[PDB]
Amino acid sequence: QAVQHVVIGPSSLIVHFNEVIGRGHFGCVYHGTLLDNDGKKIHCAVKSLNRITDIQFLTEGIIMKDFSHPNVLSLLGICLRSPLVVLPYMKHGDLRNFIRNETHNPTVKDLIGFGLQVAKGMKYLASKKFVHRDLAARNCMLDEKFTVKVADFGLARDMYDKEYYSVHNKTGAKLPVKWMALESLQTQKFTTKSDVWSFGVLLWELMTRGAPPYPDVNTFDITVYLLQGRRLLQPEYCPDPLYEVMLKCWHPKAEMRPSFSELVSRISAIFSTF
Numbered sequence: 354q355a356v357q358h359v360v361i362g363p364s365s366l367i368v369h370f371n372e373v374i375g376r377g378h379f380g381c382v383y384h385g386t387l388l389d390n391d392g393k394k395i396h397c398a399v400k401s402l403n404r405i406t407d408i409q410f411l412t413e414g415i416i417m418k419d420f421s422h423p424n425v426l427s428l429l430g431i432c433l434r435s436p437l438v439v440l441p442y443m444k445h446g447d448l449r450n451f452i453r454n455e456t457h458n459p460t461v462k463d464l465i466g467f468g469l470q471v472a473k474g475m476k477y478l479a480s481k482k483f484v485h486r487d488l489a490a491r492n493c494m495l496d497e498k499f500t501v502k503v504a505d506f507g508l509a510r511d512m513y514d515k516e517y518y519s520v521h522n523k524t525g526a527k528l529p530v531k532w533m534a535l536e537s538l539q540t541q542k543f544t545t546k547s548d549v550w551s552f553g554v555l556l557w558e559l560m561t562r563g564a565p566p567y568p569d570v571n572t573f574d575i576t577v578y579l580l581q582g583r584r585l586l587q588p589e590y591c592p593d594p595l596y597e598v599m600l601k602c603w604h605p606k607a608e609m610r611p612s613f614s615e616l617v618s619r620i621s622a623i624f625s626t627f
């Protein structure tokens with residue numbers, strides 16, 4: 354109820370409804386224009402929540418206001434007036450689309466840096482005891498300054514690409530099966546260590562420039578596949594030490610996996626060497 358420090362004046366926001374920039378299960382995302390404190394016009398992304406009809410409990414992602422880090426998506430505010438969420442505009446869309454685009458030329462070193470940037474955002478989130486539960490290349494955003502923001506959390510949580518989700522049907526939980534840690538597929542619960550397993554998959558996505566993981570393994574078999582110790586193979590252009598980092602993320606023992614803080618050290622070292 355004490356949300357007032359996040360409310361945006363409706364006469365201070367223009368939502369360009371004719372320009373859908375995204376569609377999630379909870380509602381569309383539009384290009385918008387925001388009048389900032391300094392009185393300057395700024396681009397923004399506005400997310401409508403029209404699908405959620407009854408209940409409000411979603412707004413218990415309001416804790417995202419307290420989050421602040423260059424690699425985590427900030428909340429600009431909410432506009433009441435279907436409640437609307439106002440978020441920064443991300444020039445290059447989701448990380449995975451950006452790298453999949455053949456008219457783009459990210460270098461091998463760009464690709465590793467995107468990876469490090471995510472590692473830093475996850476480091477920050479881990480320390481605030483925040484578990485993401487759906488880290489993947491399609492859920493990171495890339496701004497004009499080519500800064501990666503970890504997204505799809507808090508008021509921005511949604512499915513923007515249902516292709517890779519299963520819906521549990523008993524709990525309604527949305528499960529991105531090919532990004533999920535082994536223990537998660539078995540117990541259906543998520544921890545920082547399961548975020549670390551997903552981060553590994555994210556890395557692999559980067560080095561393949563957004564190839565689909567385990568293309569020849571069907572969704573059912575994925576579990577025995579992992580139980581047998583099979584893992585994603587090294588991409589043609591992934592430096593040996595980086596692949597080594599991926600393997601650590603997928604150790605069958607969660608406690609055995611590196612922290613996000615260790616991942617920041619290792620990737621940063623790799624980013625500088627060569």
Ligand SMILES: CN1CCN(c2cnc3cc(C(F)(F)F)cc(NCc4cccc([N+](=O)[O-])c4)c3c2)CC1
Pocket residue numbers: 374375376382398400426440441442443444445446447491492493494503504505506509510513
């Ligand atoms: C044609 N273009 C691609 C999309 N465009 C944008 C630009 N900014 C966006 C900002 C957000 C937000 F800040 F809310 F995160 C969301 C967009 N699209 C929905 C979306 C797609 C993929 C992932 C996520 N996400 O929350 O991880 C969200 C956004 C889509 C830019 C121009």
